[PDB]
């Protein structure tokens, strides 16, 4: 899903309105997260590297009174970060 999304969104800049005459080559290479700084990802935390990647580890209770719990409000934040900090 995350490979197709990047590719599909990139075709918009390649469709004609042989060579590109080196004028609009950077346009297609600017709308992707690879060659983009990670400083604007969160205005409340201006830093280079703050966010990591989420894991695929199963979570939750097999059967109990708390089946529909999942992750807590505060737990979801650390699930998408490399590691917790104490700068906030």
């Amino acid at each position: 899903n995350q490979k197709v999304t990047a590719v599909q969104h990139a075709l918009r800049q390649i469709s004609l309105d042989p060579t590109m005459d080196a004028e609009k080559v950077e346009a297609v290479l600017s709308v992707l997260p690879e060659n983009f700084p990670s400083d604007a990802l969160h205005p409340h935390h201006p830093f280079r590297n703050h966010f990591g990647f989420e894991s695929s580890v199963p979570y939750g209770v097999v059967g109990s009174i708390s089946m529909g719990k999942g992750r807590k409000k505060i737990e979801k934040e650390l699930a998408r970060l490399r590691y917790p900090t104490l700068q906030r």
């Binding site: 708390s66 089946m67 529909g68 409000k73």
Partner: protein
Amino acid sequence: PEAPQPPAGLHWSWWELYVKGVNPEYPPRQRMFAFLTAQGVDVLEMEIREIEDVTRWLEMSNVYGEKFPRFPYDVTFQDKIEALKEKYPL
């Protein structure tokens, strides 16, 4: 007779039944759900230890009447409701 359970992914969620008080058949919890929902708090994403703590005050202040809201350090029952709302907006 019984409400549906459309959880995420699966088709059964015991958490919503307990907080709503439909399965446990606990009158104190049934009246608590209609009260917090009107205040605008996300009760569905609350801890198990905190839901019972608030429910105890609702029943205690009902049978004996709203005349003993005393708490340690001079705390009012309204402060807890406001504080919890911020942590659980809607």
